Design a protein around this ligand. Sequence first.
Ligand SMILES: O=C(O)CC[C@H](O)C(=O)O
Ligand SMILES: [Cl-]
Ligand SMILES: [Mn+2]
Ligand SMILES: [Zn+2]
Ligand SMILES: [Zn+2]
Length: 452
Amino acid sequence: SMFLPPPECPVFEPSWEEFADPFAFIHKIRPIAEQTGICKVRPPPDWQPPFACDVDKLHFTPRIQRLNELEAQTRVDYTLRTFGEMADAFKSDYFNMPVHMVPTELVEKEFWRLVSTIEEDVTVEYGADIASKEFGSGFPVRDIKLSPEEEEYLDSGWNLNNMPVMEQSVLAHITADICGMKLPWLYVGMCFSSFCWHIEDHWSYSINYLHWGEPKTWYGVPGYAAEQLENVMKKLAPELFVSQPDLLHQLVTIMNPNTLMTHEVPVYRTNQCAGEFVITFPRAYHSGFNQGFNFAEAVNFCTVDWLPLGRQCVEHYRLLHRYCVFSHDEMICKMASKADVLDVVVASTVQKDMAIMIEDEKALRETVRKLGVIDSERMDFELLPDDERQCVKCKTTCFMSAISCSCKPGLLVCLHHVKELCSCPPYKYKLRYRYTLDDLYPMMNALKLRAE
Ligand SMILES: O=C(O)CC[C@H](O)C(=O)O
Ligand SMILES: [Cl-]
Ligand SMILES: [Mn+2]
Ligand SMILES: [Zn+2]
Ligand SMILES: [Zn+2]
């Protein structure tokens, strides 16, 4: 009746030994956790990264949030103290109770009541920003003079600053600017502040640590059910599914998990408490809301497990005409070009993706030659700003190749949209390519040698 909580997602309590290597652990829980999309990880009892910051010197500008189910929201001044004061007073007055007296079950039930009730117009506020000098990681980082406890945690795989640039990770090697994606984000929550249903850019993993404060309630959907969810959502809120002019205009919304569950989309929940991690798996839809004043930190990452999905995702983006954050092929080639220093399991996995890339590229080039594109010239795509190498048609970031015509200087189409560049006959076109097929096979061989 009214709200029936989804079943609980998996909770893991790894031993210190399991905990020692986050990517090993994540790979271990994956068979379980990918069936639920999200999972919760409680570190060993004594893993306690020290949090320390001055609540008066940390400033941020909060996002205002209206709480209306199915209403469109776009995906992307207080001190921490003054936000906290506002946040505690709001929750306190909302329930006419002390903050720790309010049951999580009640806040949840009430959240889903208020977002579906037209007459209620509750607005809340929240902080979401990347780690910067004005607002840094809640984890220890090298710079100033650090206490021995902070140095214990400096190099932790679970220190979310390290997670991106570890070597079982794939996003580390990217030389392109993807700041929004490899740098941790800080989230300052208050009661009912929420994050709308979404999946990560390029279907990456995400990992979220709640440093302190009241819990964060999560809903997650396994990756296999992503399209199922999107279909449900498209029916109830087609506005969200219109073409978006860029990445800064992605539309997202609050939606009751019971709605999803009614439509046979599997949904799981959890209350993430302070000191606990939540991990989201590739293409796993998730949303939730904060129970009260709190402070979280999250970052995207990509394992070798993810590489084929990363390629599928970019294909999926092309079909949708969605902008890419980075070129997946450029990342693959960058890694190939560093085959000798790559981890060996990484090298082996990159090699397999590269082989598909090359075979696809071979077929695409044969096709455009048969269309009468004859002229060609090598081109260092990675030197162009992203906005100068997006396919006119499908907006994909070009790297392996593109078609240009002197008729339209600067414009490019990918080899899927040769027909979409201009009205000139194909013999006026140039195939611009990063590598000849003959360049590519030795790059792949280097990987094979490294993998042995
Ligand atoms: O905590 C928020 O406000 C959003 C969390 C984000 O979706 C994540 O992947 O950690
Ligand atoms: Cl409402
Ligand atoms: Mn997320
Ligand atoms: Zn295209
Ligand atoms: Zn032309």
